[PDB]
Amino acid sequence: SWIERAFYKRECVHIIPSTKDPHRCCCGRLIGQHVWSISKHTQLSPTDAFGTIEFQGGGHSNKAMYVRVSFDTKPDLLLHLMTKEWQLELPKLLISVHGGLQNFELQPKLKQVFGKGLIKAAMTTGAWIFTGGVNTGVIRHVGDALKDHASKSRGKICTIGIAPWGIVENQEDLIGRDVVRPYQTMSNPMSKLTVLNSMHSHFILADNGTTGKYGAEVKLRRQLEKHISLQKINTRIGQGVPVVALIVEGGPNVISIVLEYLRDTPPVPVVVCDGSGRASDILAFGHKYSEEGGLINESLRDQLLVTIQKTFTYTRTQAQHLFIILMECMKKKELITVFRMGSEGHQDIDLAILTALLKGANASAPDQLSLALAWNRVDIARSQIFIYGQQWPVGSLEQAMLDALVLDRVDFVKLLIENGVSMHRFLTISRLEELYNTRHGPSNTLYHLVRDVKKREPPDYRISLIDIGLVIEYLMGGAYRCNYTRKRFRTLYHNLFEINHFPFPFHELMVWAVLMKRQKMALFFWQHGEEAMAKALVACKLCKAMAHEASENDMVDDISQELNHNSRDFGQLAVELLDQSYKQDEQLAMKLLTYELKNWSNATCLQLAVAAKHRDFIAHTCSQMLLTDMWMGRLRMRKNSGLKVILGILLPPSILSLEFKLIPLGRKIYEFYNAPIVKFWFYTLAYIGYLMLFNYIVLVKMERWPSTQEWIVISYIFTLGIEKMREILMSEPGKLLQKVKVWLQEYWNVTDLIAILLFSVGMILRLQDQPFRSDGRVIYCVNIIYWYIRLLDIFGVNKYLGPYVMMIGKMMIDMMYFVIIMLVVLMSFGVARQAILFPNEEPSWKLAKNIFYMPYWMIYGEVFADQIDPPCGQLPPCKTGAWIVPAIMACYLLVANILLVNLLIAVFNNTFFEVKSISNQVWKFQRYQLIMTFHERPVLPPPLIIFSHMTMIFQHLCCKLFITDDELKKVHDFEEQCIEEYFREKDDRFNSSNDERIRVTSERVENMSMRLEEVNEREHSMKASLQTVDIRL
Amino acid sequence: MALFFWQHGEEAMAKALVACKLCKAMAHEASENDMVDDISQELNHNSRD
Structure with a gap:
């Protein structure tokens, strides 16, 4: 209802001037078919021809919006129709195609190159294609090209055509108010009226009152093209949308349209095609034979005049007037870009049309780059934005690097690093503070991640990197304590917002990638910068925690499965980098598996891998022989195990006959029972010693005073009681209730405490006689069930x-x-x-x-x-x-x-x-879970762990390999061989994969037939030319 | 080179069996040694080939 109330129309009410034919009026309609003001006396009224058109026939079925408007309407009102009612976003490019209204045929390879050019240009920038509307000539070749687009590509081109309303066939078929009207794609050859083009999306059918005559659309299209160019583009850098004028052939009028575009503020570049003929070919011959613009000599001015008088069939003064208009156009020679078939004319439409927009804009390189980033067309911008030996105005690639990160420009970041925009000098503190709050690009729920951690700790909340440091440590948890939440940066935040530069920029850039779920960029951030095994294990681990938050916030279930993809990437990748490291230097790969990641909160990577809960990394062989190094401890030993260790425990002089890897002899015994094998078996024999006593004290009689048998059973329950509680009170967090929580995920630990307290409940009832001794003996017989x-x-x-x-x-x-x-x-x-x-x-x-x-x-x-x-x-x-x-x-x-x-x-x-x-595999995963905790287990026996409490308190009242940097330097050196060694073999197995070998062969044999089709035809012409002069000779 | 030398000369059935047996002997011999287990893997691979 808004379309009828805002847009107007005009209808022929007039005095019926016959002129030539009595039926044919000034408007060309029939004399009885009635129902500018000069000779047509037209009246204004609301429209009744607008809505949707269902195209019946012509192959693919498509729907095109349409509206009938007056030719004198304001272009701002038409602009608001497209953006609001037709739900069309503001385009990043306008293309205005012009040409001959007559029908024609071009070369087949010319039509294929021009066809695939105009499609591919309209996809990458999402441009608007402005045609003549009706299915005639150059517009017919446009609709044939989008007929090929609808057969092989996902896209939908905004291909808004502007035609006169009076020239379209079946005008009464197209009458309605928001009603779908069917249309016939058949065109009667007897009727001079032509149908619309089949492959179009929108229509701006303009009525001047007359029917069957043109000129009702050129001024309205021109003012709307001007009004879109005054609109600023969303980069907001001080420029509008660029407008290009694509010309194929054309007649006498298109030379004047070129002149109106060149002599315009701001100027509009034009791109012309060769091979179609008529006005494009005189533009091409004029351009190549031009010398210094308007300086054209006398032999080629006459050659231009005779080709105008022959191809266009004009007189001497009409050809001379056209040559004056061409001379006015050729004064601005630099805006014309000529595409030539074959040769060195860019071999493509789109390289011609887009670099015509670069030098046609003639803006500053910061303005120019924001256009290239808006299209994501990185191929041309590699050769354009920073061309070879092109200067550049300072202080903009850092803000444009910010624009590259937010709009997922993994390809444009590689060009910014091709310049070498210092990724550390870019990354100041306030730069990173700015990067996090921006809501460009894709959806990322870090606004929800900060939302639910303030519950445990504004729509444009200034999300500090202190706040980020908090959002990390929930999802990473453990004793990871982020380098943001150091008191150094907490003091360097409020008092301050190269000392504001982060030392290892790709590390935190991976963080900012994976929090934002742009994996394409996460992979790049991982590629560069060191500590890559650390970066991968941090990556997969956090990703699973994000998959947990997808369930906790009740986000879309899809989100869980991308993070299931991502943990299987980052996990498998980590195994691949480790496995490659084991294939070069097995010992130094273990050195990579031990050193503490002081950047990553002073934590060993293998610690982070079990926290990652990633089975396959520990299951890899180099992890296992690293674990047997811990398990065997400081003991050479050999394949034989079990027996020899029990010999050292039972027989005391057996240590001198055990191979190791009088103070040194004191150091032999000192760490012999610090070996985690030895603490394993010696805990086992003490625990079998518990069961052997505890079967006795339940089976035989139990008098009132407990015997020595029961006193040792009670002492063993007390020692494992209070030594477990040493482990809880020193179990990672500081919060006391949180240490209880840490001990609580261990399921066997929970049931142990139950039995310690349950035996202690029956201990009190057993000190007293019946009726307390009666259940005192029974409840012990339930405890014996547990310890078995x-x-x-x-x-x-x-x-x-x-x-x-x-x-x-x-x-x-x-x-x-x-x-x-x-x-x-x-x-x-x-x-x-x-x-x-x-x-x-x-x-x-x-x-x-x-x-x-x-x-x-x-x-x-x-x-x-x-x-x-x-x-x-x-x-x-x-x-x-x-x-x-x-x-x-x-x-x-x-x-x-x-x-x-x-x-x-x-x-x-x-x-x-x-x-x-x-x-x-899960057995090997559980290995490191217990092997390390025997080293953290009591040093002496559990009964002498009371003596252990003693030693602990004495020392108290009286009071990873620890590698250095240049050792660590070649450890990271070992890594950037191995990261190149993964990414060599990935495109190795991509090239040597059997299918891919088929894949390349079909594209190569594609090109074989095409240029051999050349060779047979060119040898056909060479054969006939040989025979022709052979008769002459 | 052992495959090359086994290619030439005679008694190749014999040399193939003896080569398998020496590789199995080194397989349990480096099971006694247990210094690199990747070669118990690949001496078992040499024996099986």
């Missing part, structure tokens, strides 16, 4: 016991579900038996025992044969319908023992296959 099962943990270490311990764990969840269905069937026959065998029963709790009594162990192979069918009758009376209870037994034991228990056999059998595939 706790010994399963000690089994876990072994190569072959490692699978079994956790495998029964995953089969326990499958065990749970079987218990419900077995319970139902059990309870089913359970009450069916007691409702019939004993019909007369008082309400007692002993009844519920009898439900679960006989059928439960009857599933395990004992049918209670005495009670299958109790002989009665001939004996107390047979309970009525006891001829049913043996029958229920049959259905019970058949459906349960032969179906249900047999079900728990197959669901066990094949899930065993997936879980055995992980149990090799």
Whole structure:
């Protein structure tokens, strides 16, 4: 309704001047078909021809918006139609194609090059194509080109054509108000009226009142092209949209249109094509034979006049007037860019048209770069924006590098580093403060990440890097304490906002990449800068934490799967870099696996890898022989294990017969029981010593005063009680409730504390006699059940016991579900038996025992044969319908023992296959989890860990390899070989991959047929030319 | 070079079997040594080839 109330129209009400034909009026319509003011007397009224048009026929079905407006309407009102009602964004380029209204045919290779040129130009910048509207001539070649676009490319070209309303066939077919009107793409050859072009998107059909005559659209199109060029482009750097005028052939008028474009403020560059003929070919011949612009000699002025008088069929004074207009155009020779078929004329339409916009704008290089970044057309800008030996005005590539990061310009960053914009000098503190708050590019939920950490600690919140340091440490967690939250930068933030320069810029740039989820750029930030194994492990780990936040914020479930892609990238990549490092220098690769990442909060990378929970990295071989270095400790030893260690523990002089890798002999014993193998077995024998005592004290009598047997059992529970609580109070965080939380994720730790306190509950009841001693002995017999099962943990270490311990764990969840269905069937026959065998029963709790009594162990192979069918009758009376209870037994034991228990056999059998595939690897993952914690375990025995408490307190009251920088320097040197060695073999296996070899061959053999099609035709003409002069000779 | 020398000369069935046996002997011999296990892998690879 807004279109009818804002746009106007005009209709022919007039005095009917016959002129030539009595029916044909001044407007050309029929004399009875009626219903500027000079001779047409036209009246203004609201429109009734606008909406959508459904194009019926002509191959592909497409819909084009349309409107009929007056030719005298303001271009700002038409501009607001496109941007608001038609939902069209402001274009980054305007292309205005002009040419002959007559139909013509060009060369086939010319039409293919010009066709694929205009499509590809309209995709990369998203330009607007301005045509003549109707399906005639050059516009017909445009709609044939977008016919090829609709057959092979995803895009939708904004191809807004402007035609007179009076010339289109079937005007009554196109009458409506926001109504879809079908259109016929058939054109009658007898009718002089022509249909619209089939491949168009919008129409600005302009009515001057007349029908069948042109000129109703040129002034309105010109003013709208001027009005769009006054609009500033979104780069906001001091420039409008660029406008280019593409010319194919054309007639007498297109030379004047060229003149209006060149003699305009601001000037509009023009691009002309060769081979079509007529006015484009006289422009090309004039341009090549021009010398110094308007300085044209006398032989070539006459040659221009005779070709005008021949091709355009004009007189002598008409050719001379046209040559004056050409001379006025050629004074501004620099704006014309001539495309020539073949030769050195850029071999492409789009290299001609776009660099015509560079020198046609003639702006400052900062202004020019913002256009190139707006198109993401980096191929041309490599040769244009910074061309070879081109000067550049200072102080803008740093702001343009900021624009490159926010708009995902991974390719333009490579050109800024091609100049060498110092990525550290760029990255001041306030530069990075600015980079985080900007909401350009894609969606990134760091506004939500800062939102939910202020709950635990404005729409344009000035997000500090102090705030970033906080947002990191939640998602990274642990003892990672970010270098932002150092007191150095906290003091250097409020008092200050090259000492504001970050020392290792790509490190924090990876952070700012992966928080913003631009993986394409994350990979680049990783590529450059060192500590790359660190950077990858940090990358995948954080990514999984972001996938956790996708679930916690209830973000879109898609977001989880890109981060599942990304952790499988960063994870696999980390294994690839490690594996390559193991293929060069195995020992120095281990040196890379040990050094503390002081930049990354003083933390070992292998510590970060278990925190990454990434199975495959630890599972790689170089990680495992690094773990056996810890496990074996300071002990040479060999393949033999177990036995020899027990020899050192039991027999004291065996240490002198154990190979190591009187103060040195004191140092031998000093760290012999600091070996984590030795602390393993010697904890094991002390724990078997616990069970061996604790079976005794429950099986034999227990008098009132506890014996020496029980005192040692109580001492062992106290020592493992208070040494576990040393581990909690020194377990990473400072918050006391948080250290309780840290100890709580360890599942075996939780059940241990339960049994320590449960035995201590029965300890007090046991000091007193009955009725307290009565349950004091019983509850100990429940504790003995636990410590038998706790010994399963000690089994876990072994190569072959490692699978079994956790495998029964995953089969326990499958065990749970079987218990419900077995319970139902059990309870089913359970009450069916007691409702019939004993019909007369008082309400007692002993009844519920009898439900679960006989059928439960009857599933395990004992049918209670005495009670299958109790002989009665001939004996107390047979309970009525006891001829049913043996029958229920049959259905019970058949459906349960032969179906249900047999079900728990197959669901066990094949899930065993997936879980055995992980149990090799997850065992190796759990290795570092326990090996390091034996080194952090009590030094002496647990009973002498009371002596250990003593030593600890004495030292207290009285009071990674630690490598240096130049050692570390060649450690990083070892890394940038290996990062080049990954990215050599990735495009190696991309080239040698069999499919790719097929891929390249088809494109190469594509070009074979094309230029051999040349060679046969050119040897055809060479053959005929040879024979022609052979007769002459 | 062992493949090259095995190519020439006679008694090649014999030399192939003896080559497999010496590679297995070095496989358990470096299982006793346990200095580089990548060559127990690739001496098992030499024996299997």
